[model samples]
Target: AMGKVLVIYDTRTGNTKKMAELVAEGARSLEGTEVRLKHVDEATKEDVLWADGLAVGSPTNMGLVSWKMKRFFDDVLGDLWGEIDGKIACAFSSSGGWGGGNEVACMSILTMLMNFGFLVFGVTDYVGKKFTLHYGAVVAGEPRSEEEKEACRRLGRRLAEWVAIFVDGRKELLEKIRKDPARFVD
Candidate 1:
């Protein structure tokens, strides 16, 4: 029941773009998950709607999402402001150095989804300790080494699992209504 995962990324140097593709490849490897990788500009509302979960990637500028990624989100006005509720999402980023707003950019995108009512799902506890935005992967420095690739893979898989749960929960609710239409409506 794992729903499709869409990886949308904006890149200036192609490094972040490569990571986005790798993340989609990882998600596709999972039996129940479908994956789509697209450049931010090429992604459309139809693509967004097709996904049950999403992973957004972009390079960092100062301490926020890049202008390209920001513009991409801006173009998603219709859906971002509508009821794409209960879908899961996460993010990834590329930066020139560690602690240079890369992770912040990822969370910035996640925060927007929070406002849209999408459930951000991923690692909540790292090393058995709680930390914010453990919900997605972040890569500092160019090239997105193997370690970052794995992090992106983990993010993809985790969100895919959440989509599965979301689907099951939704189906159960429908089943209940069909079996007993007047039991709870009052």
Candidate 2:
């Protein structure tokens, strides 16, 4: 089945925007996938609904998510609360330096996704040109480092994989669970 991925973000210095583009490019590497890259200024709630997988990026602002990103959730996607359940979601960020609220920024996006009932996920497999971050893709300023660049791409591919499997195998998976629920218990 074909999958749709939306890579949206708000950037003050275009750092986060570069990450969004890399993420979108990574998603496009997957088979039968369509990816959209948009800034929060141009993105709409309709774009959110259009995606099976969602990757949101933000800039860290004083150990918090950028206000523009916060506003995007509150105003643009507020009405979608509870309507976008089960969509695959991932988060990423760009900050001034290491440990300067990059994960916090990503978590803010994840929190909103959880509130919207989206299935939030980050790195699971470590397959990439560079090492992966557990929380999400991140960069100090621009993604000048190869690690940062690949991390964004990896996150995008991961999100797209989930979207593909979740959409394609959902009915069969539910049937399997319904037939023998305990088999899935770990």
Best by TM-score: 2
lDDT scores in order: 0.70, 0.81
Top candidate by lDDT: 2
Instruction: Kindly report which residue stretches of model 1 are placed more than 4 angstroms away from their true locations once superposed.
Output: 124-133, 168-186
Alpha-carbon shift of residue 123 in model 1 (angstroms): 2.3
- Candidate 2 overall lDDT versus native: 0.81
Task: Kindly give the number of clashing pairs for every candidate.
Answer: 0, 0
Tens-digit per-residue lDDT, 10-85, candidate 1: 8888878877876787677666788888897888988888988888888877767788777667767445676777
* Candidate 2 similarity to native, TM-score: 0.86
